[PDB]
Amino acid sequence: MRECISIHVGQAGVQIGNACWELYCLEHGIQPDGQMPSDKTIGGGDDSFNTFFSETGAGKHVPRAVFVDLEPTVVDEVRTGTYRQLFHPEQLITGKEDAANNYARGHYTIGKEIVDLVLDRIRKLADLCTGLQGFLIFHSFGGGTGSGFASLLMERLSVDYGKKSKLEFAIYPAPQVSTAVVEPYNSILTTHTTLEHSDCAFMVDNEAIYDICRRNLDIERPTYTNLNRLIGQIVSSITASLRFDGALNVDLTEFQTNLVPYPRIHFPLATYAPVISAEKAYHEQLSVAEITNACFEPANQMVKCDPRHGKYMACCMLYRGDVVPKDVNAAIATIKTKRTIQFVDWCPTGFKVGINYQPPTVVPGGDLAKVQRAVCMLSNTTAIAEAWARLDHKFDLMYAKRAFVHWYVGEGMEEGEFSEAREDLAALEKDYEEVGVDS
Amino acid sequence: SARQLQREREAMEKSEKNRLLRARKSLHTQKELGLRHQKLVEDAQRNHR
Amino acid sequence: MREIVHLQAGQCGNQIGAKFWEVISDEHGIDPTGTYHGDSDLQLERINVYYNEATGGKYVPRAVLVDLEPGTMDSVRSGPFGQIFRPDNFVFGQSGAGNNWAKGHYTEGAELVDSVLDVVRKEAESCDCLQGFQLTHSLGGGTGSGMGTLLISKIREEYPDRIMNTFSVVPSPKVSDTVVEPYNATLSVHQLVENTDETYCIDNEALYDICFRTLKLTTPTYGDLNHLVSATMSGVTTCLRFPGQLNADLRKLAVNMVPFPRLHFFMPGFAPLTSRGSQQYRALTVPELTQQMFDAKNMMAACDPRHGRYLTVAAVFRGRMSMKEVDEQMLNVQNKNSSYFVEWIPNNVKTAVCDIPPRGLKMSATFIGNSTAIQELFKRISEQFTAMFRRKAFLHWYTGEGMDEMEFTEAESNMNDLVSEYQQYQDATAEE
Amino acid sequence: MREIVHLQAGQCGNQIGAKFWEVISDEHGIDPTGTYHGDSDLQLERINVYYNEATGGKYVPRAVLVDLEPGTMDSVRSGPFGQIFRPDNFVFGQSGAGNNWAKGHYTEGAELVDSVLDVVRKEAESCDCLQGFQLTHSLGGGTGSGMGTLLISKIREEYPDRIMNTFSVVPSPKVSDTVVEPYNATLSVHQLVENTDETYCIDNEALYDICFRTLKLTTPTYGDLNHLVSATMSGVTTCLRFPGQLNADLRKLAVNMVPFPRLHFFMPGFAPLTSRGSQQYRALTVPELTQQMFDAKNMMAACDPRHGRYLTVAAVFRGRMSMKEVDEQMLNVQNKNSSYFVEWIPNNVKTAVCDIPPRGLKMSATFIGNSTAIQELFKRISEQFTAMFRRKAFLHWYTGEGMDEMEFTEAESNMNDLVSEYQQYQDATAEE
Fold it and tell me: Helices A416-436 and A183-196 sit at what angle, rounded to 10 degrees?
């Protein structure tokens, strides 16, 4: 039935998958051992856990995910954790040499060595499943493991399965802050692969996360744990109608069909709400209209872009928790008449209604409070094209005198791809502005 | 190789010439500065009188 | 698995290597006997990088000491930890180098090199896979400089796919130890720029000045310098020895840190250099570290980085603080100090934090940066070399060995080309 | 957050700064060790203005001591609180100034100035945002006067958007300490009127007269003067240190009390100056404070404010009394004493009451006003400078340093222009 396979490439992908799995186990009452030892006082678990987990003959739950990494240090770090009794060691493939923010080695001399192993793993996982809809590929553009290895694997997955949905989730190199220097070098190569060989791609960054946490959660020393928690909550909200039901169930296909207006424009803008701390959720009356209006605020966007620079074409609306349809109708009536929000002169309306009866849960030790209902937004606008413009500018000003290119030449690749990627990005941007231009 | 290096020191000279051009620009800007101060003093004093 | 083979050359190299081994043994909890007396967690898993598994848990060091004088042996064995190493690795000859590079390379570098090649080959074959080879030596003599370059050439010829990192000691006209030191330096720099992956600059006068004006030591000696360089080496290797959240490795640095192979020199540096009475009155925070890591007072060269432009910068931290502070600090530094780094390349600072703090100190962070400051040293070395080679003084000793004089000519031609390249890349303009 | 960086210059400046630091430490409850032993409420929140947050709650002072003689260090460090400051800030040379402004500024102001700029730049960068810099020095010597002007000029050139307030000691013909004091005063006045925001007048003879005729002390010494100036500084700075109902800051006072940048001099003063036996017989009320605040007996300058007209007056109170009494008092004073202030500008008195009383005294109030009384000091300084410069006595010392005599000519020309401006603004007539 509604079952999907998650793919985790790189340290970021592995930790994001860990956060997602732990969120799923805490929200479904799944114990870290893998059994149901709660024989005295029950606390839930009688639901449809088949979407992600599996039920054995002895009552065991086996995760359905792919934890691959070229560096073994992350695999060792996860292995010594408290959840080592949940997954299987065959699912965490180590490696001798890693990419570590390099596309050349991780795409030719490193990623091409372990192909059959992961292919057999994913084939076995797919055979163990009955109904397959899409995939959850978690990687990063800055990380060499999450860029070269991810590209080469998805290129084979696309040609091996055309009828299945291919999603994408990674991290965007912020124009202001960054972790490494060669991030644009891997990004300019991964964008072409994710554009000409995938169906949908979700693009997020970290500076917006830092801004929203310091503004709402009010923390002075942030950490990656809350960053992963936010992404896990976003993913759970996206795939909410699959594990459970509601008034209007919205499956992966149901929203993916409309979220893609064109084969070239498939980069939605995600926005989660409410992103608040414990104290920010007590003396605050929360309704649907206010949070829906706040979702369009650029400060609450995970991508640093002003929506007023461009306009919207396609919008995907979701909900999770005790939400009343009258509030949704009132919010839609309010936003359709707002002059601040810009939209194309041809599409008068577009959005979805996903009613989820199950309210979001909390985690002991996290920062999220007990909120009666949640909301997530996936819109499509041309105002986000500035990020590609800045990335192209940076690549051009780094490519004039060929900085840190001799390494890639020595590793083995054809230099014309830089020109190919540059011209492909230029054409894609041109298409974006052509679409953004009305009559 | 030494000819490429001498091309690059010629580029050094060209960068110095760019600095000269921007210095001319700065001279024009500081002339416009003397002008705002002169106007904002004299015309305002005429208004005061 | 992934191990690192360590090499030794030169009496100063031998003493600094012994100091580093003692420092790491103390940090990781090793008694002088040879057993294990640690009490940590990560000191057992990746402990095999510098040690070897044997019976009874008695880890053995992995280092080959190459020397031409037997007098260095008995000195380093008599120490509290000189009884823990492998006596077979201490390959010494019978005749001294006499501070001669050519004589040490020719006479003392033919019949003795075979044994060290055999033992290093045996050590490499004893392990499954390796990353690189670390050699610590000095350019002030014929032992470290006369033999290390040949050994590096041999190992790169045999195993090209290995990391060639070293910490040779740069000379100084103010504080000198050899009359023919410029000749040996000129001879060694050719091999360093031709058959070496990367090289770090080490100076004694700068460390002496630092320990005098900041540490304020009573009787500073070579032991303090060895301790400081050992701490620097430990801070460099903690990225692999003690993995954390964002771990790094030597080769990733050498790739991201070296824009051109001809320019592979660096400048190390450690942050918390405080006096004895200032240890109990200090503020453990990020901006103080950024300032002691950005100014030229704590840095360990006898030159001024402010005379040029920063090319590549790496900030390696070892502690548990944050991630946002580092990026905001580097961003505001780049915004304010715009006239100190290459404007063509933005974001010239690399972030690296080690979650595992070192033993004995909570906060630690090192500097691996390549600023435009070695041009002065290069030009003064070239000038003094030309001055001495004009009338050909102190040359008959080299002539009597068998090697000709065209080697000096080609070396000085290479030096002129390299310094011209450095000076034309110093003021890297954006356009015409 | 909003912090104030404090500066030091001159031996008298050093001693008065140390006294002020001791006074504020005792007021806010700081032990000589360095910890916190206070028991108040507002002594923890805004305490970071003059201190810095460190581990264990041990706050450190923020003051850089600048001197040319090492003989001040041992004096100021052996005291009960000389072990709490930062020895790094104590930058000293090897040669004395010899009461020479020219020699100190030229010789002892070139190779030593770099260190103090480095440390003050580090202090500024360590904090997030600042308001101004406070320097306490004296015009009687080459240490305070020779360096204070230079450092103020440097900090204004680097950071123009900062408050430049100082408390330099004006000389006096009756009580003299330097033979060439008129020369140093004339040279310093140029920089004070050219590159300084505001300056306050400090005299020792008037304070001696006050403590003799009102305090009735047995053996008054410099310690009493240091205590009084420390109390005056604390009363001035309590507007920001201890917020109350109507708070003020340095820049608002500097804007509102200075009609013209060429005239930035002030006339400070403290109200409750009573004898030892009169402390237990006193009536604490507004009119008494107003009278002791308005009369020329309690003021600390060696001149008579009654010879001119009041220009700008600020009454800063520190206690819990009222608002109505202040306004009615100033109103009736302006009504009665109509021939003592500029009639062209009514309401020249500024009201300021600090709800937080000081530690040890329940009522305190200071005077910061610019009255027309410095003209006599300026004219007598100009006359003595003219008399000394006529035959050019005590000039070969300055000439041998290198600087010419045109500097004295331009200084006296600016002096004459300033005094002419002061006297033609003293008689501020309404119309023709």
Answer: 60
Q: What resolution in angstroms does the PDB record give? A: 7.7
Chains A and D touch (3+ CB pairs under 8 A): no
From A27, A207, A254, A420, the catalytic residue: A254
Question: What is the CATH classification number for the domain harbouring C282?
Answer: 3.30.1330.20
Contacts of D119 in chain C (CB under 8 A): none
Q: State whether residue C131 sits within 8 Å of chain D by CB.
A: no
Q: How many CA atoms lie within 13 A of C3 on its CB side?
A: 20
> Do chain B and chain A touch with ≥3 beta carbon pairs under 8 Å?
no
How far away is chain B from the Cα of C421, in angstroms, using its nearest Cα? 7
Instruction: Judge contact between A389 and A429, C-beta under 8 A.
Output: yes
Mapped onto helix, strand or coil, the DSSP state of residue D4 is: strand
Q: Which helix (H) or strand (E) element contains residue D164?
A: strand D163-166
Q: C432 and chain B: CB distance < 8 Å anywhere?
A: yes
Q: Which chains touch C (3 or more CB pairs under 8 A)?
A: A, B, D
Q: How many Cβ atoms from other residues are within 10 Å of residue A48's Cβ?
A: 14
Kindly state whether residue D432 falls inside one of the protein's structural domains.
no
Domain CATH for D8: 3.40.50.1440
Please tell me chain C's helix, strand, coil percentages from 3-state DSSP, rounded to the nearest 5.
45, 15, 40
C321 chain-D contacts, CB cut-off 8 A: none
Does C281 contact chain D (CB < 8 Å)? Answer: yes
Are A199 and A165 in contact, with CB atoms under 8 Å apart?
yes
Residue contact C429–B12, C-beta within 8 A = yes
Measure the CA angle with vertex D144, ends D142 and D147; round to 5°.
Answer: 80
On whether both C283 and C239 belong to a single domain, the answer is no
The CATH number covering residue D410 comes to 1.10.287.600
Query: Cα separation of D246 and D244, whole Å?
Result: 6
Q: Are residues C234 and C277 in the same domain?
A: no
| Domain boundaries, position D419 | 375-425
Domain membership of residue C145 (yes or no) is yes
In this structure, the answer to whether residues D319 and D221 fall within a common structural domain is: no
Q: Helices C144-158 and C181-194 meet at what angle, rounded to 10?
A: 10
**Phi and psi (nearest 5°) for B3?**
-70, -40
Does the annotation place C420 within a ligand binding site? Answer: no
**Same domain, yes or no: D17 and D61:** yes
Task: Report the residue of chain C nearest A210, measured CA to CA.
Answer: C324
Q: Domain count for chain C, please give it.
A: 3
Residue A254 appears among annotated catalytic residues: yes
In a domain, D391, yes or no: yes
Give the residue carrying structure tokens 């004459």: D416
CA of D84 vs chain C CAs: smallest distance (Å): 10
The two tokens of residue C403 are 């090697």
Same domain, C364 and C405: no
Which chain C residues are Cβ-neighbours of A394 within 8 angstroms? 346
Strands (E) across C234-348 are located at: 265-270, 310-318
CA C135 to chain centre: 8
Both D161 and D180 in one domain: the answer is yes
From which experimental method does this structure derive?
cryo-EM
Of D222, D238, D257, the one marking the end of a domain is D257
| Helix-helix angle A325-335:A288-295, to 10 degrees | 40
- Does D296 share its domain with D355? yes
Residues D356 and D384 in one domain: no
Say yes or no: C247 contacts chain A, CB-CB below 8 A.
yes
Q: How far apart are the first and last CA of chain D?
A: 51
Q: Is C230 labeled as ligand-binding?
A: no
Q: Within a domain: residue D430?
A: no
Nearest-neighbour CA in chain D from C288: distance (Å): 7
Last residue of a domain, one of D239, D257, D275: D257
Q: Which residues of B touch C424 (CB under 8 A)?
A: 5, 8-9, 12
CB contact under 8 A, C344 and A179: no
